Amino acid sequence: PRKLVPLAYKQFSPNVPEKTLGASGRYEGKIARSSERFKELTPNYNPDIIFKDEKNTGADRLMTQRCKDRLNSLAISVMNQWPGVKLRVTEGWDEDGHHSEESLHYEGRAVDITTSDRDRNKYGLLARLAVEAGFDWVYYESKAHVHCSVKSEHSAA
Template identity: 50%
Template sequence: MAPKVFTPRQKFPDESEAAAVGPFQAAIKRGTPEFAKLVKNENPDIVFKDEEHTGDDRMMTSRLSARVDDLAARVKREFPGLKLRITEAWDDSTIHAPTSRHLEGRAVDITTSDVDHHKLGRLAGLAVEAGFDWVFFENDLHVHASVKK
């Protein structure tokens, strides 16, 4: 049974990310055919942190984008007045592990728009309900959620 509210460091399914979403294959580089296959999520119900001021946080695989849209609707229903917030999606910087699913555009780091860490446990539960293939309450700054390729 999936938890409705995660505790810190909890993951679902309770296995490695590689087991749940498949192994890392290769980082997607800007300007390549693989990059051209990513979609740009323009959902107005999502707040994008866009730390890099590039719009890169909107870039993701179509499979991930579908789950993100589903989650955004659930967040609106669960927390009236708030939105889903994405702090990271696809990224080609070196801040992530060299095998991070962010480099493949199939992982997001998420919070609610009020950036209240007390809501992260329930946000992780909503991500499971939204159909993400692996959800991890990574730390008190965000939940990490990823999908199969």
Template identity: 60%
Template structure:
């Protein structure tokens, strides 16, 4: 029994060390591209309080640690952008345009989601217009959220649908995951919370690709450099629920030796 427990502990330590050394394994993401950095099978809508990935919002495998609140007078404020996508509805209850302000990465993901939402619920023009994503909250400098909220950095949005149909929120959350948000939670009966990694994160700045010298763990126990990776290799990776598994390499979406 003691020996079995030791082997389990050793396995867990090996898995943790592998993830810390290799980073979060998910093709060429995250990055500032408009395609989703992860591929998820289409599954059922979220249930209330469900979040993906199944780890804390502030962990490396999700949106990461906060960088700190950004005020209008902060030098970092100039790095935020305004979203004027006509496919998105902004509540703008503050009447100061703050719900349009967000990080570049957040804007990119929201624009992808906007297209997905209209494709999901196309309506019947001109009588019934397509459903659009509705932003209820984005960047905020009124400190109305939790102390470490990513809303203060423009890295989070609370969203619903333009028709205010709450029965659509579970599907909306699933679409947000497919759009590439780094963390999505069906947070309340009124909205879905989505957040992204910081634009200053090294992975985002470099496009999200792995370094050629990075080491990877193979299913047979061997390790090799990323530059030596071949189609057909089975490498340790992380599922959307945070569990470890070995996944077969089937293609290189973007490779430069």
């Protein structure tokens, strides 16, 4: 076994920009509810993940399959790491534009996460778990959350 080292505040892994091929790839444009690419999104109803749903639309559950797969892996790891605690998503797909111009939140490929107990002391390690769970980019973005993202299925040629 290897010792798990938490990410530092503001650290990202891999240590390259989010939208590079070695990380989460490219911004492929906003997905609107009315758009064809809306079917790229699938709702995650994993019983072991808490969704904040702060906008009361259920949008934070809607994500790509790869995002769902990595998130579900992380959900198991979080429960393992801190028995009694669960993975919590505070932001997923954003229909409103509350991030930078080319956010992967706009296309259901990024989540902001915490632990269910909102213990900010856990977030560095939570970030490390997200890396081990196979998220393509993980960024300890604020003291209040970790930003995790995935590649699309449109770069493999």
